[PDB]
Design a protein around this ligand. Structure first.
Ligand SMILES: *[C@@H]1O[C@H](CO)[C@@H](O)[C@H](O)[C@H]1NC(C)=O
Ligand SMILES: *[C@@H]1O[C@H](CO)[C@@H](O)[C@H](O)[C@H]1NC(C)=O
Ligand SMILES: *[C@@H]1O[C@H](CO)[C@@H](O)[C@H](O)[C@H]1NC(C)=O
Ligand SMILES: *[C@@H]1O[C@H](CO)[C@@H](O)[C@H](O)[C@H]1NC(C)=O
Ligand SMILES: *[C@@H]1O[C@H](CO)[C@@H](O)[C@H](O)[C@H]1NC(C)=O
Ligand SMILES: *[C@@H]1O[C@H](CO)[C@@H](O)[C@H](O)[C@H]1NC(C)=O
Ligand SMILES: *[C@@H]1O[C@H](CO)[C@@H](O)[C@H](O)[C@H]1NC(C)=O
Ligand SMILES: *[C@@H]1O[C@H](CO)[C@@H](O)[C@H](O)[C@H]1NC(C)=O
Ligand SMILES: *[C@@H]1O[C@H](CO)[C@@H](O)[C@H](O)[C@H]1NC(C)=O
Ligand SMILES: *[C@@H]1O[C@H](CO)[C@@H](O)[C@H](O)[C@H]1NC(C)=O
Ligand SMILES: *[C@@H]1O[C@H](CO)[C@@H](O)[C@H](O)[C@H]1NC(C)=O
Ligand SMILES: *[C@@H]1O[C@H](CO)[C@@H](O)[C@H](O)[C@H]1NC(C)=O
Ligand SMILES: *[C@@H]1O[C@H](CO)[C@@H](O)[C@H](O)[C@H]1NC(C)=O
Ligand SMILES: *[C@@H]1O[C@H](CO)[C@@H](O)[C@H](O)[C@H]1NC(C)=O
Ligand SMILES: *[C@@H]1O[C@H](CO)[C@@H](O)[C@H](O)[C@H]1NC(C)=O
Ligand SMILES: *[C@@H]1O[C@H](CO)[C@@H](O)[C@H](O)[C@H]1NC(C)=O
Ligand SMILES: *[C@@H]1O[C@H](CO)[C@@H](O)[C@H](O)[C@H]1NC(C)=O
Ligand SMILES: *[C@@H]1O[C@H](CO)[C@@H](O)[C@H](O)[C@H]1NC(C)=O
Ligand SMILES: *[C@H]1O[C@H](CO)[C@@H](O)[C@H](O)[C@H]1NC(C)=O
Ligand SMILES: *[C@H]1O[C@H](CO)[C@@H](O)[C@H](O)[C@H]1NC(C)=O
Ligand SMILES: *[C@H]1O[C@H](CO)[C@@H](O)[C@H](O)[C@H]1NC(C)=O
Ligand SMILES: *[C@H]1O[C@H](CO)[C@@H](O)[C@H](O)[C@H]1NC(C)=O
Ligand SMILES: *[C@H]1O[C@H](CO)[C@@H](O)[C@H](O)[C@H]1NC(C)=O
Ligand SMILES: *[C@H]1O[C@H](CO)[C@@H](O)[C@H](O)[C@H]1NC(C)=O
Ligand SMILES: *[C@H]1O[C@H](CO)[C@@H](O)[C@H](O)[C@H]1NC(C)=O
Ligand SMILES: *[C@H]1O[C@H](CO)[C@@H](O)[C@H](O)[C@H]1NC(C)=O
Ligand SMILES: *[C@H]1O[C@H](CO)[C@@H](O)[C@H](O)[C@H]1NC(C)=O
Ligand SMILES: *[C@H]1O[C@H](CO)[C@@H](O)[C@H](O)[C@H]1NC(C)=O
Ligand SMILES: *[C@H]1O[C@H](CO)[C@@H](O)[C@H](O)[C@H]1NC(C)=O
Ligand SMILES: *[C@H]1O[C@H](CO)[C@@H](O)[C@H](O)[C@H]1NC(C)=O
Ligand SMILES: [Ca+2]
Ligand SMILES: [Ca+2]
Ligand SMILES: [Ca+2]
Ligand SMILES: [Ca+2]
Ligand SMILES: [Ca+2]
Ligand SMILES: [Ca+2]
Ligand SMILES: [Ca+2]
Ligand SMILES: [Ca+2]
Ligand SMILES: [Ca+2]
Ligand SMILES: [Ca+2]
Ligand SMILES: [Ca+2]
Ligand SMILES: [Ca+2]
Ligand SMILES: [Ca+2]
Ligand SMILES: [Ca+2]
Ligand SMILES: [Ca+2]
Ligand SMILES: [Ca+2]
Ligand SMILES: [Ca+2]
Ligand SMILES: [Ca+2]
Ligand SMILES: [Ca+2]
Ligand SMILES: [Ca+2]
Ligand SMILES: [Ca+2]
Ligand SMILES: [Ca+2]
Ligand SMILES: [Ca+2]
Ligand SMILES: [Ca+2]
Lengths: 540, 540
């Protein structure tokens, strides 16, 4: 058909109501009276009564103002019946479009936006982002397009133009330079959005930016030069602690100190760090020792764990140390294999005039010499002059003496001012003299009767050679009660044989030898005889 | 509903016909085939067939070109029935608006406009007014708004820009200066009107302006100096006529002449004007007279009835007159009570030597003296010398003479060259002489007998005093036939009485008187007597 165009109507209209929109006519009215009515939402349906028609003229009206924001369009159905009561025309659809008007102010997405950036970054860096909206049209008008802006950053210091915002997108960026967490950490700037691309109505928001941290700062010592005293030897011990103040953020690696000495003399120092006021705690690496050095001039520089965000001054601490003195024990010089001395020494004679030395050249402390180790008592010391003399009777020949030795240990004490011990061994070579003289091996025989065979006997000397070289056998009172002497060819033994057919048991034979001579006297080597033929038998 | 918008269509469209306008669909076609038709003016109604629809597709078309000027809009009704034959949708109204196109040239209201203005008016004066129209739109386009103009005034002289026209209203006004009915009275200018405020199409008209008249001109004489001759006395008469030429419009007061003399000597001149060539007709106010003046130098200026529309030169006419001569009658000087003359004058004696005078000093014309009035013939005149002598017998005493007078009139005639009369009266004092003498009153008595009483008688003189002073009575032959004389005391009468006793009737008495003397003789005063006693009785 020839339909009927949609009807545009403005919003928030205002004048004298009613307002005729249009007029409709059924031509089938030649016959009876026609009754015009109309139906739909806004008609008889909810919102009832916005539009109504004059049953007799065919006029359509808007009865009151409208807000497209509420309902932006309506569709209606129109009718025409006869007085008799019958419909005449197939109904007719009707449309109305509600044209937008700038009745709406915009509104920010949130009531407050927050942001953050680091202090050392470069100009032209994107920080935050902000939103807002207008409910009016924005597809055929500007009643709903906004334009963003900024008008007041607080801390109007260092300067007041650190940022800008993209008018269309509302994004903010760092424009200037001079950000420092250490002086001004959080800005509060006021934003506004406007109707018709900055032309219409405006509103406010608030965005707040916190500033991350940077290693803008270096560490600073609170003393620059310290001093402490120290002892030579127990040690590995705490000398002095140090103080400092970095200014970036505390629990952070831009706040933790790292040290080191420049030069470690004997490399006898270690230094650690501590999460207190991360003071510098210095200590001794390997004890000290001395009388060698009293002075210690060393320097320690301090850094952070992480590198610096800028060239900065490295700052050292210069420190002086002094070693207190402890006084140590003295010592005999050697451990003496000294005196190759003979057995004939006169009880009270100079053996070893000895001396001991003591470390501490503070030496105005003497000591006393004491002896100590010990198989039995011979020797003697002058305690205030360390003089070892030889008292007593010695005898290389016999008991304690093991290999050609006699080892003895002695002491010495550090007095004068405190304490001390000195353990020193002393081996002294004893010597030989020909003391003893020759002696027979077996002392009792068992001779036989009829024809006894030679009674083997031998010789032994306690002395050391030559002193036991060859012999000379001799038979004293009974050199004839019949007894005849004899030597083995290979030196050592002697052959003892009677020369008479003598008696039934129990009787001695006086013996007498010599080796350089010395002559011993020996003696009786008794002789038990019991009935027989010729071989030395078990007796009775 | 969701109707269907009006359809705009251009006018004088042109391309390949048909032209689809729009397509309609009934959705109730799920069931049968639907048949699309359409109705109305331009459809099935007159203009039939401008639009038609394709029963099966639902397309609407314009079949041929259109002229909004003919029909600027159409309304149509669309239908849709089922094959079975039933309608499905309530019909649908359809509208088409025909948009204007500049197909129309404008046209002047009239084929020729006329106008008129007066020559002396000022620049910036509204004269005519002109109209014209275009039939195309003029409420949303310029297809129908005109712009007026002018492009050719004829008589491109004095200059060619006497006027302008208001482009929007088409009114014309005088812009320049130099209008003269007398040289260029009617302009013919060509006008044009145009489409789109002078932009589109144009056409022509014609406006013609006549120029009213003004008193631009003054009157001019055709002679500047005239002359005429004239006679002394019959008069009030036409001397000379005058000619002139004003140049404005003829039957008009800017063409009628008005005159006047500058100086009217004795105020004896009048001059009128005449609707001929309104010549100046001069005449004589009160006759002239003379021998007093021959010359007349006078001037007459000429104006118009209505003042002048500009300073102009007043132009006079200087004129000379000459008076011809007529010769008049002579006159005795006075009218004479002249001659106190006596009665004794000698017949033929000088009474009044008189003279008369005649006007015209051209005097070489004499006259003749004649007498004329008349009781009887005494006097006489010398006609060629006017001398009145006295012939005859006169007599103061008696007949014609009334009071002491005698009046006579005489004449004199102007000859020599033409004609003349002179009536002059003449009274002449006559005088007294003592002519007559005394005389008795009654001449006949009636006396009585016995004793007659005195017969009274009296006296009378024809003379004038002293000449009749007192008397002297005398009785002649019968101074005694008995008669005795007597005078009255108071002079006049006389007492007559007998002295004898005398006779019976019929007889006279001779009487005789005197007054200076003169002596009269009188006479007989007869006396009739009849019988009696004493009183004068009636007789017998
Ligand atoms: C930003 O927020 C802080 C915290 O309240 C406030 O003190 C400051 O004034 C605001 N503006 C700036 C530029 O710091
Ligand atoms: C020396 O060492 C001591 C240790 O107690 C310290 O207090 C002092 O500051 C250091 N410097 C000097 C000059 O004494
Ligand atoms: C670190 O020590 C320096 C030296 O006096 C001082 O100026 C600074 O304030 C200290 N740091 C802090 C956080 O106090
Ligand atoms: C202190 O500094 C030294 C030197 O680098 C380092 O070895 C040590 O680990 C540090 N102490 C601490 C607790 O970090
Ligand atoms: C530390 O060493 C320096 C370098 O010679 C010296 O001046 C200072 O006296 C020493 N000790 C102290 C107490 O500073
Ligand atoms: C000698 O030195 C040895 C070796 O240590 C030791 O066993 C002995 O007791 C010391 N004295 C003697 C008498 O041998
Ligand atoms: C010296 O050392 C000895 C070791 O035999 C010890 O018994 C003694 O106590 C020390 N003497 C002193 C005075 O400290
Ligand atoms: C020295 O005396 C000390 C103290 O008893 C002892 O420990 C040590 O064994 C002794 N010997 C030597 C050779 O120092
Ligand atoms: C040997 O025997 C004799 C005889 O009785 C006896 O006197 C002696 O003591 C024994 N031994 C020695 C070495 O004399
Ligand atoms: C005006 O009309 C007269 C009369 O026909 C004509 O003679 C004349 O040429 C026209 N134009 C002017 C300027 O007189
Ligand atoms: C004189 O008057 C006569 C009258 O007939 C006239 O014709 C003439 O122009 C006038 N002027 C002169 C100088 O004659
Ligand atoms: C009027 O008289 C003057 C004088 O000759 C002449 O120039 C003028 O043309 C006359 N007027 C007319 C209409 O002829
Ligand atoms: C001619 O002029 C005289 C002088 O004003 C005037 O009185 C007279 O009426 C005029 N004649 C006519 C016919 O207008
Ligand atoms: C008119 O009067 C003038 C003025 O004196 C004179 O010149 C003239 O002759 C007179 N008559 C005539 C004929 O112009
Ligand atoms: C005299 O004059 C008178 C007065 O007019 C006149 O009547 C009379 O006729 C004249 N003549 C005489 C004789 O009186
Ligand atoms: C003169 O006047 C007389 C009047 O009495 C008249 O009769 C006569 O005609 C006149 N004479 C002449 C010559 O005109
Ligand atoms: C003079 O004569 C004339 C001509 O008849 C007459 O009319 C008139 O009366 C006479 N008388 C006088 C006094 O002029
Ligand atoms: C008087 O009478 C006488 C007598 O008859 C007579 O003759 C006479 O004529 C009369 N009158 C006069 C005047 O004489
Ligand atoms: C020093 O002592 C610390 C504590 O035991 C140890 O961990 C470190 O290895 C030593 N040396 C150094 C150079 O720190
Ligand atoms: C000082 O030395 C440290 C390393 O010990 C270094 O990191 C720092 O950059 C140095 N100072 C300067 C100004 O380069
Ligand atoms: C510490 O002090 C000493 C002496 O003044 C100097 O040699 C050393 O360089 C100093 N360290 C610093 C960082 O100044
Ligand atoms: C530490 O500081 C001292 C003195 O200021 C300087 O001479 C030395 O070079 C510094 N050490 C380092 C490693 O920077
Ligand atoms: C004594 O000192 C010596 C060094 O000559 C050593 O060999 C020996 O072991 C020491 N003996 C003791 C018990 O100290
Ligand atoms: C005695 O001398 C030997 C040879 O020098 C030696 O090796 C040994 O130790 C010493 N003492 C003993 C009991 O062998
Ligand atoms: C002159 O004669 C005319 C004609 O009768 C008259 O109307 C007018 O009043 C007279 N006087 C003047 C000054 O025109
Ligand atoms: C000449 O006189 C007339 C009146 O007689 C007057 O209207 C005219 O304006 C005068 N001429 C001039 C140039 O004024
Ligand atoms: C007419 O002519 C006479 C003599 O020339 C002169 O006096 C008079 O002014 C003239 N009038 C005019 C208008 O020239
Ligand atoms: C008429 O013209 C004469 C001469 O041109 C002039 O002298 C006179 O003033 C004029 N008269 C008037 C009334 O203008
Ligand atoms: C004659 O003239 C006289 C003037 O003296 C006049 O009184 C009288 O009327 C005249 N008589 C006649 C008839 O003219
Ligand atoms: C005569 O004289 C008288 C007086 O002067 C005069 O008045 C009269 O007119 C004269 N005539 C008559 C008839 O009275
Ligand atoms: Ca709204
Ligand atoms: Ca809106
Ligand atoms: Ca808005
Ligand atoms: Ca910083
Ligand atoms: Ca730092
Ligand atoms: Ca920092
Ligand atoms: Ca030491
Ligand atoms: Ca020491
Ligand atoms: Ca010591
Ligand atoms: Ca020995
Ligand atoms: Ca020995
Ligand atoms: Ca020996
Ligand atoms: Ca047309
Ligand atoms: Ca048109
Ligand atoms: Ca047009
Ligand atoms: Ca003119
Ligand atoms: Ca004029
Ligand atoms: Ca004129
Ligand atoms: Ca005269
Ligand atoms: Ca004359
Ligand atoms: Ca005359
Ligand atoms: Ca007389
Ligand atoms: Ca007389
Ligand atoms: Ca007389």
């Amino acid at each position: 058909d020839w339909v009927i165009p949609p009807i545009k109507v403005s919003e928030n209209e205002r004048g004298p109501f009613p307002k005729r929109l249009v007029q409709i006519k059924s031509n089938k009215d030649r016959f009876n009276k026609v009754y015009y009515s109309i139906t739909g939402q806004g008609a008889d349906n909810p919102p009832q009564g916005v539009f109504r028609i004059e049953w007799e003229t065919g006029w359509m009206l808007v009865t009151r103002p409208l807000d497209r924001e509420e309902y932006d369009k309506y569709v209606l159905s129109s009718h025409a019946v006869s007085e008799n009561g019958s419909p005449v025309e197939e109904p007719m659809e009707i449309t109305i479009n509600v044209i937008d008007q700038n009745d709406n102010r915009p509104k920010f997405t949130q009531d407050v936006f927050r942001g953050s950036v680091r202090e050392g970054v470069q100009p032209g860096t994107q920080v935050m982002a902000v939103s807002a909206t207008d409910e009016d049209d924005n597809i055929d008008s500007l009643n709903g397009v906004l334009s963003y802006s900024i008008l007041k950053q607080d801390p109007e210091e260092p300067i007041p133009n650190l940022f800008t915002i993209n008018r269309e997108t509302g994004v903010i960026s760092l424009i200037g330079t001079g950000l420092d967490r250490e002086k001004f950490p959080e800005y509060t700037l006021t934003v506004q959005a406007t109707d018709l691309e900055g032309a219409g109505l405006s509103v406010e928001g608030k965005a707040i930016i916190q500033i991350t941290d940077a290693n803008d700062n270096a560490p600073i010592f609170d003393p620059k030069t310290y001093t402490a005293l120290v002892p030579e030897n127990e040690i590995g011990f705490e000398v002095q602690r140090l103080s400092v103040t970095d200014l970036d953020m505390p629990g952070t690696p831009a706040w933790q100190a790292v040290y080191k000495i420049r030069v470690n003399e004997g490399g006898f120092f270690n230094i650690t760090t501590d999460p207190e006021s991360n003071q510098g705690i210095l200590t001794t690496a390997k004890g000290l020792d001395f009388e060698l050095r009293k002075q210690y001039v060393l320097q320690i520089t301090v850094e952070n764990a992480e590198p610096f965000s800028v060239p900065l001054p490295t700052s050292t601490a210069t420190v002086t140390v002094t070693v207190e003195d402890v006084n140590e024990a003295p010592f005999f010089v050697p451990a003496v294999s000294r005196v190759d001395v003979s057995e004939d020494l006169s009880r009270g004679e100079k053996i070893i005039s000895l001396v001991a030395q003591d470390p501490d050249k503070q030496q105005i402390q003497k000591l006393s010499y004491f002896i100590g180790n010990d198989p039995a008592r011979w020797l003697t010391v002058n305690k205030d002059n360390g003089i070892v003399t030889g008292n007593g009777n010695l005898d290389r020949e016999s008991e304690y003496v093991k290999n050609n030795t006699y080892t003895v240990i002695m002491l010495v004490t550090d007095d004068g001012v405190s304490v001390g011990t000195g353990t020193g061994t002393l081996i002294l070579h004893v010597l030989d003299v020909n003391d003893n003289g020759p002696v027979p091996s077996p002392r009792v025989f068992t001779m036989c009767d009829q024809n006894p065979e030679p009674q083997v006997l031998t010789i032994s000397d306690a002395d050391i050679p030559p002193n036991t070289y060859p012999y000379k056998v001799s038979l004293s009172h009974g050199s004839d009660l019949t007894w005849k002497a004899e030597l083995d060819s290979k030196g050592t033994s002697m052959l003892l044989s009677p020369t008479q057919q003598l008696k039934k048991g129990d009787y001695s034979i006086y013996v007498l030898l010599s080796d350089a001579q010395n002559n011993p006297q020996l003696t009786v080597v008794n002789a038990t005889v019991c009935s027989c033929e010729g071989k030395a038998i078990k007796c009775q």
